[PDB]
């Protein structure tokens, strides 16, 4: 029962740790966990324990991984 | 006088769960069935309930399947 | 005069059924017949009565064929 | 002396009726002459007196032709 | 505490007259010396003062020609 | 608990002069140390001493390197 729908569906990712993919406007995807959202990025854990901050005007969707 | 029709024409889609092709700016399409939208995202579910979250701004088009 | 002309110009194109084509930031076009327009989007009816929502922040231009 | 020099450079455009190129974001250009602007796009004509409604968000920028 | 830097790195590029190369987001460059910025866009002049208006929300990046 | 966790974790970067890869959405990246942030656009400087003005919509990701 969300009004937020978008943002309730990726702070369950981000409670779940759900692998995703991410798709970017590049063409291009990451892959990796979601740690934490605001109204302009994302933080992506990836593999390897590397770190990004993602632009969310960037991506074009998230999808699980798995 | 029948303000918002795009919101009103997507939640259509949703009532009768009517397969869509969503086009991207990337040039890539997604395929399936939306569940919800809003001011940001909507949700997309394939053929066995895999749930994407479509950014609106990263989309081109929404047309029905045919 | 019309203080909102991107906004009259597609009402017009509304009104008439003038066909059209609205070529996409992806590059590519659509064809078909623009039936209503808000700020998020427009509908545009194909040959085949097939309905398409556009979002606005997609489009590049808007051309009548 | 203006403080919102992108319109008042379109209007003189305008008014002038210069010819321009307009290179938009999918990278390809249109020529012609811009007829009127206002926040969410500009009219072009072009040397046949094809009129288009060109969106002002995919511009990416407005050149003179000649 | 020390608002605005973009803006200001811009005037400041202005001022100098420094030559600069600015890519845009279709992944193709413009040269020329930057005359003038407002919230929308940025006049930028060739080496014989032609004026190209360049949409802000079409650039990746301005850094000078070096 | 910052709420404001985007600009934080670039603050960071600035504070901490942590090497970076920016990409950009034409694809390609930058390399280089971030030196300021603000709501449009921030500042990498790479290894030549190049300042460059990179706008934030034009961002993809920002990585440490």
């Known amino acids: ?3 937020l729908p978008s943002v309730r ?3 369950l990712l ?3 740790q ?4 991410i ?3 590049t ?6 966990t979601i740690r934490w959202q605001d ?3 994302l ?3 990836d593999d390897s324990e590397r770190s990004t901050i993602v632009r969310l005007a960037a991506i074009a969707y998230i999808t699980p991984r798995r």
Chains 1, 2, 4, 5 share one sequence.
């Open 9 to 11: 569906q990726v702070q």
């Open 14 to 16: 981000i409670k779940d």
């Open 18 to 21: 759900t692998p995703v993919e």
């Open 39 to 41: 109204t302009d990025g």
């Open 1 to 3: 029962d969300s009004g």
């Open 43 to 45: 933080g992506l854990v």
């Open 23 to 25: 798709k970017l406007l």
């Open 27 to 32: 063409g291009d995807s990451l892959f990796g």
